[PDB]
Design a protein around this ligand. Sequence first.
Ligand SMILES: [Ca+2]
Ligand SMILES: [Ca+2]
Ligand SMILES: [Cu+2]
Ligand SMILES: [Cu+2]
Lengths: 295, 293
Amino acid sequence: KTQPVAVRFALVADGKEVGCGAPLANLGSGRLAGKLHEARLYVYGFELVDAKGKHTPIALTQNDWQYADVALLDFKDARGGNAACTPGNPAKNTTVVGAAPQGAYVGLAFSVGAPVESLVDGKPVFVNHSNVEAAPPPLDISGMAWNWQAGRRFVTIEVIPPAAVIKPDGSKSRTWMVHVGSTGCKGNPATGEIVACAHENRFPVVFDRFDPKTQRVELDLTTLFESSDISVDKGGAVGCMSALDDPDCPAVFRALGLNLADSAPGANDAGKPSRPGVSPIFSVGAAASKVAGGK
Amino acid sequence: KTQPVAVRFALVADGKEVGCGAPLANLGSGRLAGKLHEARLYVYGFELVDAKGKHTPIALTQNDWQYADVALLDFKDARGGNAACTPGNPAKNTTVVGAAPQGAYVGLAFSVGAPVESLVDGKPVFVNHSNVEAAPPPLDISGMAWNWQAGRRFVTIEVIPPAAVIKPDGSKSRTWMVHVGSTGCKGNPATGEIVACAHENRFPVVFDRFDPKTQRVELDLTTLFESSDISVDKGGAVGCMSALDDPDCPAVFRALGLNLADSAPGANDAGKPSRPGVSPIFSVGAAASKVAG
Ligand SMILES: [Ca+2]
Ligand SMILES: [Ca+2]
Ligand SMILES: [Cu+2]
Ligand SMILES: [Cu+2]
């Protein structure tokens, strides 16, 4: 009936595979040498696409890193050292694993973020706005929780530039932070009431041609920070934390493929993809072949 | 010729074994439910003590967590979740492993912190004031470095109160931090100069009776934060980062068993142990237990 699926993800920067303690070269518009502090994101709704364009959902293996249809990617090593990834000291979780019905597939689709709810045994459960203290793994990572109302910062990428970050008032900060999460969220679920968010800030990613056995999904840090001066914060939270009045988020949300505010007056598309299925930071890359070799 | 040696460490709070994502109950002088953000420390100079009182050094296995005679303990889980430690998701590194000459031993002695130098193949290398960008593991962890001149913050324990920490001017930090390292350090080794520190802030820990196969060393977070209102900061860095004029550091250094400043004018003991060999936050407990000693 089923066949195992394994979708590998990779973090890249300046055209090389980074992650763990690897250095980050030529980051931002200033082309600075930065250190990776954190690179975590939730992904969900994984589907394989066949030649006739139909979408077959991947049943995710239920473990500590995957719950219902939601998986948590983390590109840092557990030690927190200054060495690049190795089998002994690897990135914490870079592969989504599961099963799909047997058959031939050609493409891949998935979504970036934490969905509002998901299904377990045909029954729904709150995901994005759940309690980080009560939610099962991997939704119990408070380092990725804002609060229930705001939901999770379901994309947390944090880099450390060589000369820190200068804020408008002049005070210096250590880390340039990219926190992607829902905004305009009204109603507090901690009070037991309903919550709805004006800007969801989730987006799908579609690859018409993707072979999991010889390819991987590459998250490009260079694209992410391309038009951002990571030695400077121009307003709001240091870096970008999804706020519409934050001057630094427009460049980031463009690199994400999301409309920060409305693209046009009355477009009503704030917090939605500007080209669904396409996100400039996500691309297909060659990967070590899982086709078992002889000899 | 030699025998394996494994010294188990455990983090406890409110008389319960904690670590990983176990909650910290009744923490601080306000006795709040806190969460562990980070619990790491360097330890060195491990020795076994026999009944006659002789000291036998333990040769540390060289790996990603132990270099020369220094080991790094890390009580957090790799995931960073809100679950207690389990065999499938355990704390990162809580056992000091090595070998010692075969013999009958009763006690244990070691020291907390990162030493200035240690011998590797009979030759000395700089440890505490090494370059975190260049040193070998486990000295390559920026999360425990200040700079070379200041050395490592060789004790890093960070707790999160239920609401944000409020600084004296009303602004808010998320974590209440304990960063123990040497202070009063002059000279910059980044530029080839000799460094000297007025306050070393390392201390020995001596247990007269410690059986490594049935017992463990317990670091008590309850004692560490007992006289610390972790919901506020009274000045300086948020929490205690060993500054002599930080109003929050006196209570912390008492719990550690260290003199922050001189005990009395002329005493010349600042940065030295208040009672060499005993630290209020360190005790012996049963090795396979859910409860503190
Ligand atoms: Ca900003
Ligand atoms: Ca303070
Ligand atoms: Cu944020
Ligand atoms: Cu500090």
